[PDB]
């Protein structure tokens, strides 16, 4: 039984970065041979493991997170990196044994008129904890006056929408991301077997 890598990578639509989708992958034979053999990826960062022997290693538990960001913000998907994405949307643990796979996707996640359905988190009072998903839309209180659900000055929406348009620059084009958490802590996700 082969681990369903295709179910995540070749999925139809990906979730938004703030509400990233995590797929637990276990109880299967790993098949990283498809991953490195693609040459369609813009970024391929693997920490702890090199993208060569991955197919011949055993793993206790595996998590496959996925979301969509813009090109410029792909660099922030790295253990330790900081910004608005690595602090308010998706933070990786500083002991990340896994891979950070990403590829361009202006064909899928860009609507002819401009796809304003992928959203990120702009304001948040604090950084995220490792592997945190803030699905809150509470109007941001940027002062001391209580907003009480109403918009206005010092009362902003904590989520902004990606202006994904096909005319946007390379850095402003949607790049799909799949982050494989490889091992921590039985065992099942193996390679040689």
């Amino acid at each position: 039984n082969l681990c369903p890598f295709g179910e995540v990578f070749n999925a139809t639509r990906f979730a938004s970065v703030y509400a990233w989708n995590r797929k637990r992958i276990s109880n299967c034979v790993a098949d990283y041979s498809v991953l490195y053999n693609s040459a369609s990826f813009s970024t391929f960062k693997c920490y702890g493991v090199s993208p060569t022997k991955l197919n011949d290693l055993c793993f206790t538990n595996v998590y496959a997170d996925s979301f969509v960001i813009r090109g410029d913000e792909v660099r922030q998907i790295a253990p330790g990196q900081t910004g608005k994405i690595a602090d308010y949307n998706y933070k990786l643990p500083d002991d990340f044994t896994g891979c950070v796979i990403a590829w361009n996707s202006n064909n899928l996640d860009s609507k002819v008129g401009g796809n304003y359905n992928y959203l990120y988190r702009l304001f948040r009072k604090s950084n995220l904890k490792p592997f945190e998903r803030d699905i809150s839309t509470e109007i941001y209180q940027a002062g001391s006056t209580p907003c009480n659900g109403v918009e206005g000055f010092n009362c902003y929406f904590p989520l902004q929408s990606y202006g994904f348009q096909p005319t946007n620059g390379v850095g402003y084009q949607p790049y799909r991301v799949v982050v494989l958490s490889f091992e921590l802590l039985p065992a099942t996700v193996c390679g040689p077997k």
Partner: antibody
Amino acid sequence: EVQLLESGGGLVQPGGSLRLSCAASGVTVTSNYMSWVRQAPGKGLEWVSVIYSGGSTYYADSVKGRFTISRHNSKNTLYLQMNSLRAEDTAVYYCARDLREAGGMDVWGQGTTVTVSS
Amino acid sequence: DIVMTQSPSSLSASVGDRVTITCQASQDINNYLNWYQQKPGKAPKLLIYDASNLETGVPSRFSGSGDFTFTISSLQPEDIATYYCQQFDNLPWTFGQGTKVEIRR
């Protein structure tokens, strides 16, 4: 009620240290993007540093290893520790709240000039 | 690091005319450009944010466009200043070179 009052030093002499302040009113420092922007006596603005909300510091390259931003929400004040001060650092220093894609540095300070000379 | 080269500062327009300040950048970021107005001897005030969106207060004489442009419809005596353009690129938030508007009479 909106106001960004600044309490800064004036003279320190070269190779010295100072510490600026940004007493806020109408905003809140601990939950906002706060940045410092200085204008040298050459009528040109320059970005200095930022602290974000969740505590991530980013500085310009010219003041990377010398300057440091801190905050105390106890007094709702913002600071800029200017250690190892130089000479071109002479400028009027402004603090502002950069809302980025929802307004940009909507509220500004008033200006506290820092002069460095022997 | 980005380099935004604004238009020259020798603008001697008249009252009721216009201004057209252009802010070209090195590496173009999208909709991430702010316009400010540093009145003579005062802290910078914000006018245009996100390339074109106006701020509460700024008169309907000010306008922008998304390599970038700034425009005043009917130049009024109050608009004496040095207009800068900002950009959220990648820490540093590079500023402009300063375009000084000068009202003639």
